[PDB]
Amino acid sequence: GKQLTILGSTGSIGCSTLDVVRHNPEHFRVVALVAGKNVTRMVEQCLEFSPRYAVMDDEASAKLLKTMLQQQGSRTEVLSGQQAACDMAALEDVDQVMAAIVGAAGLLPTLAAIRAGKTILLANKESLVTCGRLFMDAVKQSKAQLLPVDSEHNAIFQSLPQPIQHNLGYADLEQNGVVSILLTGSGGPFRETPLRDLATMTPDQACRHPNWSMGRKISVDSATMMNKGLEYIEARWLFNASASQMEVLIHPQSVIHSMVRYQDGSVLAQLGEPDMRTPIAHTMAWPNRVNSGVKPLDFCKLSALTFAAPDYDRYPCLKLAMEAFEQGQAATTALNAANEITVAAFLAQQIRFTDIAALNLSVLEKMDMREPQCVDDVLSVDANAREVARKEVMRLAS
């Protein structure tokens, strides 16, 4: 049985992760759960998985949770605050750490797990976007095994040779017969929309994800392909890949999750249903496999699979992300920050769908900052990009 702490257990990934342990109680044991303010869900989780510790990121939620657990008879030790989260992510006992706390708050805890040499199930994919360097450096200096939970990166992981799977992040791609990494995306809902109409697209239209359903912010990112841009940035750090070793390909059906091209012409791909339990279960069980609860993909009920090259005039955000990577970590975290503001602004109906890319570009032009040397520096860049982003939204909205 492997012991693990789930960073961000009340969220979607967290629940999908707990579902997987539910399918394999003999294989996994939850030692600790860490969450934010969703006390009700945290209570059910503690009552069902009996963790040694339950941590909230707030004293008000911790006491509120502590009262309910005691009322229910649970003796799970309650804690509060980011420091506690970091302690859970470094417990001598635990083997794996499901890093699913999104945003800045996930940085330090995830870093703690890495330093503690734990096996990290990286769901907090945005932490490579901002601390790619720091994180990969720390990963190598501790030999902590990184296992990407993101569907695209996981697909690539599974399609990569074993020597790279181990030593992930500092292994030599070319030396292992790998030509390039093929990152796939659906192209969003506006794949075939006339460029002329992109400026008038509405939040509800942009939120109609082509295949499966998901959050509004991440849906918009899928429509601008910024998600693919952020994933591009992450992949470069994660698989130690150069610009010429990366390819982006639109694949509307999203049956293939991503691929890897090899020296001899071979292309290895991972395919499957749109259910996060699959990549999650893959990482939790690696190098082996376990039942995930996901139905077997039925090839006889699929839409014909197609592919196409990404048109940059249609996806300026995708080009913007690629260009930013070559500029530095300051640029990528700034791009991420800005996109956070502009998308929320678009959803709030303050700016046009097309204003997302332009404003995003605009913020990077104004930044002009030095590459961070630590997390605290990253937070600094992030914060400055958000205010600049907010000024432009207000400047454009007024």
Added chain:
Amino acid sequence: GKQLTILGSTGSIGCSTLDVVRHNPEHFRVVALVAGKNVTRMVEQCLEFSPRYAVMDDEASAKLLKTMLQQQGSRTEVLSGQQAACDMAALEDVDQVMAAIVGAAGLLPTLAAIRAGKTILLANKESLVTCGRLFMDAVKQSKAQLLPVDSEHNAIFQSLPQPIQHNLGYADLEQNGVVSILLTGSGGPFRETPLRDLATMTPDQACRHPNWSMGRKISVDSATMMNKGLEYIEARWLFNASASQMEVLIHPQSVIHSMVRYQDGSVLAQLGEPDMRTPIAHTMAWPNRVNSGVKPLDFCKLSALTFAAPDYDRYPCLKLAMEAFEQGQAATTALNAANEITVAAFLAQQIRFTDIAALNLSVLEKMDMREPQCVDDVLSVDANAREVARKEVMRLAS
């Protein structure tokens, strides 16, 4: 780097193999080339790769080769006969033996390489189709390493976890998280043809292989799907798969070469150009990669990829193969034998296209002998199934 013997060097696979060698001088050294009667090519190959030995089918063909090699200044030593052919596959200083001699011949030579514990580049279907059990028991005894060269089997191997690859046939699919092997095939030229018309199809119509060109006998095998049936038989032996661990899908475009599904929902696949140098280069460099000279496939220049389940009314040969497996090596050897006679008879316009499956089934029901104990036994079953089959064809010509 690697010393190798090439069984059937003058054929298609053999040449593709030398091209990979020509592409990687520093990695492979040709120790021995074995062929039939094509002295012309054996000369150029011997001149270009300076093997130590070369053997031809008969003394005449060899006598002539020896003269030209001497006259051309070549130092290679000439031999002839099956025993010399087998001796080359067992040379102490040989690492890999590309087993590309097809049919009843090449059986003993590939068994020779297995018995010598070498790494076998299996590009000979006859082996597993007629001696599946004898051979897998043999490779298990000598610890020989089988690397499948055939496109479908190679794709499956590439999509299988490392523990299975290093222990082919001997490994356990379920313990390693594999739920099943997905064998793909184009479905042939008659994939869409009305069932009633199959009886009138001509050799020429049967020989229009859907995606790329190939032999007439093989094109026909693709039209009847006997092609996939034989591969189905091999796959079960090669990867130790049960009936329920096998799936046969029709994939018209042949971009996906085959796949394997895992317990967590993941499906790994191998894609590429229809060039044999890819799978050959793969087995030669395994566990690493080498240049094959094959153009990387362009995902933007493909036709929509589709799938469909094979209808046994349309492809009775497929089902026949599946049934023969349950009956043992005598049944599979008999099916293979009968099929060579009926296909050839079809090509000669002696029987109808639909007479192929009909007569294959029929000779199978007339066959007695069951479960051979050695190669000579299968050879005997082969010889008898051919005679029964020839009479079938001759009786039908009345």
